């Protein structure tokens, strides 16, 4: 993989640096590297493909070196260099498209697309130039196991779950108490709803709790915690658990009081926030515990008193909400984001070349079912395909 990244990087740097009129004193090192790569490659025959609608290609490298005699590059040299580089670029794109599709439950880290196994040999190890990118650096680190981490902007770690939970229900659905939540991508929008507005409750207070359990530990998360959840704040017609009947939901928002957010880890508490909103931080957490309340206003105007009466009809259901969006974060493992096109490239290639479903990745690579079960084999294969996708996308966009 390191040699793949090196090929991609030096091809990028050759398409960038080598232009007519530039100075050999600035590109001598890259030219020596390219010529050494050409030498190491001359005499090998590679085969690529053989799965799904991917064609079967054969590559035979026999090129000529690049002259070190000039001082200012001319077009007759750049043209030859680009004729040489486009073949390598097509070869690398085809290797990456051969490697992103295959899977294995046994040593997923160990390469597939056997041309890449061949390139992992010891006669090709002279091609390595530099491994600076985030994904390749974390690859080399996790191989030489150390405290690693990927940085994410708005990460997609929550699988889409839009559900409710009723702690007091009836067949008529006229006096309910419960909590609703939508956990999706980077956002959690939770809303505790009581139809009685905490009149029969002790101290005119009713509590609600929401426990989210991540599959992989995060770190240094920057979060925005706001009140008045939006998608649980308008009229609704929701179905029962067993789907038998439906029920009406006319919410009216109130502030959550004595709120508490506990970021935990292996059941132990790490961070705790009381009545704070706006921007917050969490240095490490595998679990989030939101705890909020609905407190009946002791004083009330005529309108709100006539809207929260002491009888069963209850045509305005009191609610208390909380939106929580993870803006940035850092994670030892690899996930999806709103910044990088690695997952998109992988999925697009698979959809394009009609790849059969394998033992590791779910059918079609649906991120919901891919993050709801993030077993180490899936994690390794996902890291591998994301890394080679980053590689392929450093050249072909």
């Amino acid at each position: 993989m390191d040699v793949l990244y090196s090929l991609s990087k030096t091809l990028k740097d050759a398409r960038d640096k080598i232009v007519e009129g530039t100075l050999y004193s600035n590109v001598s090192d890259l030219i020596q590297q390219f010529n050494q790569m050409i030498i190491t490659m001359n005499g090998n025959e590679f085969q690529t493909g053989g799965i799904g609608n991917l064609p079967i290609r054969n590559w035979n490298f026999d090129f000529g070196l690049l002259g070190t005699t000039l001082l200012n590059l001319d077009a007759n040299y750049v043209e030859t260099a680009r004729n040489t580089i486009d073949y390598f670029v097509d070869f690398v794109d085809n290797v990456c498209m051969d490697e992103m599709v295959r899977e294995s439950q046994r040593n997923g880290i160990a390469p597939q697309s056997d041309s890449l196994r061949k390139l992992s040999g010891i006669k090709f190890k002279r091609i390595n130039f530099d491994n600076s990118s985030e994904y390749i650096e974390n690859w080399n680190l996790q191989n030489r196991r150390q405290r690693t981490g990927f940085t994410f902007h708005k990460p997609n770690i929550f699988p889409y779950s839009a559900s409710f939970t009723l702690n007091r229900s009836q067949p008529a659905h006229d006096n309910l108490m419960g909590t609703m939540w939508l956990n999706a991508g980077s956002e959690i929008q939770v809303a505790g709803f009581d139809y009685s507005c905490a009149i029969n409750a002790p101290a005119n207070i009713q509590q609600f709790e929401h426990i989210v359990q991540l599959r992989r530990v995060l770190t240094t998360a920057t979060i925005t915690l706001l009140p008045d959840a939006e998608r649980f704040s308008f009229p609704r017609v929701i179905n029962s658990a067993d789907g038998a009947t439906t029920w009406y939901f006319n919410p009216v928002i109130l502030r959550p009081n004595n709120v508490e957010v506990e970021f935990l880890l292996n059941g132990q508490i790490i961070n705790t926030y009381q009545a704070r909103f706006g921007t917050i931080i969490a240095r490490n957490f595998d679990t989030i515990r939101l705890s909020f309340q609905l407190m009946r206003p002791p004083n009330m105007t005529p309108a709100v008193a006539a809207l929260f009466p002491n009888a069963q009809p209850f045509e305005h259901h009191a609610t208390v909400g909380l939106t929580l969006r993870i803006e940035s974060a850092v994670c030892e493992s690899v996930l999806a984001d709103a910044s990088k096109t690695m997952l998109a490239n992988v999925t697009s290639v698979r959809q394009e070349y009609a790849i059969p479903v394998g033992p590791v990745f779910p059918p079609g690579m649906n991120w919901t079912d891919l993050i709801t079960n993030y077993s180490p084999s899936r994690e390794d294969n996902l890291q591998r395909v994301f890394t080679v996708a980053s590689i392929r996308s450093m050249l072909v966009k």
């Binding site: 799904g52 698979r350 009609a354 059969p356 479903v357 059918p363 079609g364």
Partner: protein
């Protein structure tokens, strides 16, 4: 959608084209959601 996510063999593709009940029921027993959704939609359209 099926050929994309559940990558399909030549025989399965030919039989899906010919609308073969054998392969249709092999998928329905394979628990293919892309097909179960279509069938539930056929139900919701054949209700009345």
């Amino acid at each position: 959608n099926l050929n994309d996510n559940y990558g399909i063999s030549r025989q399965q593709a030919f039989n899906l084209l010919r609308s073969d009940p054998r392969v249709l029921r092999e998928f329905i027993n394979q628990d293919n959601p892309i097909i179960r959704n279509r069938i539930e939609q056929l139900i919701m359209q054949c209700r009345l």
